[PDB]
Amino acid sequence: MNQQKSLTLIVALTTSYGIGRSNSLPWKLKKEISYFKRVTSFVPTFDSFESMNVVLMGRKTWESIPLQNRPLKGRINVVITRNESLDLGNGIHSAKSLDHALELLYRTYGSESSVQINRIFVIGGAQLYKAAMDHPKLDRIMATIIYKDIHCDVFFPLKFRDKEWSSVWKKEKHSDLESWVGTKVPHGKINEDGFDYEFEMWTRDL
Numbered sequence: 001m002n003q004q005k006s007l008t009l010i011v012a013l014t015t016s017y018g019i020g021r022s023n024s025l026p027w028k029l030k031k032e033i034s035y036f037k038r039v040t041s042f043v044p045t046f047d048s049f050e051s052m053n054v055v056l057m058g059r060k061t062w063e064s065i066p067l068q069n070r071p072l073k074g075r076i077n078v079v080i081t082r083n084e085s086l087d088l089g090n091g092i093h094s095a096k097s098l099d100h101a102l103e104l105l106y107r108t109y110g111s112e113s114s115v116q117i118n119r120i121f122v123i124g125g126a127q128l129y130k131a132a133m134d135h136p137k138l139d140r141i142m143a144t145i146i147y148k149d150i151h152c153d154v155f156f157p158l159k160f161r162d163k164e165w166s167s168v169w170k171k172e173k174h175s176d177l178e179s180w181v182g183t184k185v186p187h188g189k190i191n192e193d194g195f196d197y198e199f200e201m202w203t204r205d206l
């Protein structure tokens with residue numbers, strides 16, 4: 001009663017795998033954040049009485065969220081840290097690993113609990129994304145590719161869009177992205193702040 005859901009990773013990255021700078025995001029793309037919130041919050045209409053998605057994030061990512069914005073609303077948040085702890089929040093869940101977070105979640109939101117888990121997302125940062133990529137239950141990446149080599153200081157840890165990984169990681173058709181996300185999703189390049197980005201979905205067989 002532990003390995004019955006697959007994990008999905010969601011990330012916005014440049015073409016050089018850049019994800020962050022100065023402990024935040026090195027762009028401010030309101031439509032991209034709005035895509036993030038929709039994908040991570042979407043629960044099919046039949047289920048959205050009692051079901052919620054989960055966002056799993058590293059301690060530095062938790063600290064990068066503006067104070068007045070965390071925990072991230074309408075999702076079950078869990079912060080991963082090896083220091084139990086001082087953290088903070090709000091009744092905020094924490095765990096010392098991805099698997100400890102899963103155990104915590106299945107124990108807390110058990111078959112009887114009023115709130116039920118729908119999908120579980122890993123939402124960053126690089127260190128946690130590294131652990132997610134090694135996890136046997138991770139099978140899907142929702143990537144926003146940012147077509148600009150923006151200066152970054154933190155990078156996505158595995159070059160999953162590169163030739164060396166292309167027998168393992170496959171890019172899905174846009175209709176399949178829409179069907180998974182449950183809504184119409186812009187197709188191809190969007191321009192905001194004078195650079196182009198686009199939404200992709202990649203999968204790995206379990």
Ligand SMILES: NC(=O)C1=CN([C@@H]2O[C@H](COP(=O)(O)OP(=O)(O)OC[C@H]3O[C@@H](n4cnc5c(N)ncnc54)[C@H](OP(=O)(O)O)[C@@H]3O)[C@@H](O)[C@H]2O)C=CC1
Pocket residue numbers: 010011012013018019020021022023024025057058059060061062064080081082083096097098123124125126127128129131154
């Ligand atoms: N999509 C995007 O573009 C995203 C970008 N970001 C960016 O990423 C940067 C944050 O990345 P990063 O510095 O790698 O930080 P993380 O958010 O991965 O925080 C790392 C910390 O979280 C804990 N942690 C992470 N992985 C594990 C693990 N497997 N087991 C136990 N503890 C773990 C540790 O906490 P402790 O030290 O407490 O033990 C570690 O010090 C920021 O710039 C942020 O803006 C973040 C999310 C999305």
Ligand SMILES: CC(C)c1ccc(N(C)c2cnc3nc(N)nc(N)c3c2)cc1
Pocket residue numbers: 010011012025032033036061064065066069122123124142143144
């Ligand atoms: C605007 C506030 C609520 C906010 C601040 C930071 C973030 N982060 C960490 C963030 C922001 N955008 C993101 N975009 C994608 N595609 N994927 C991610 N994992 C991602 C993560 C999200 C929301």
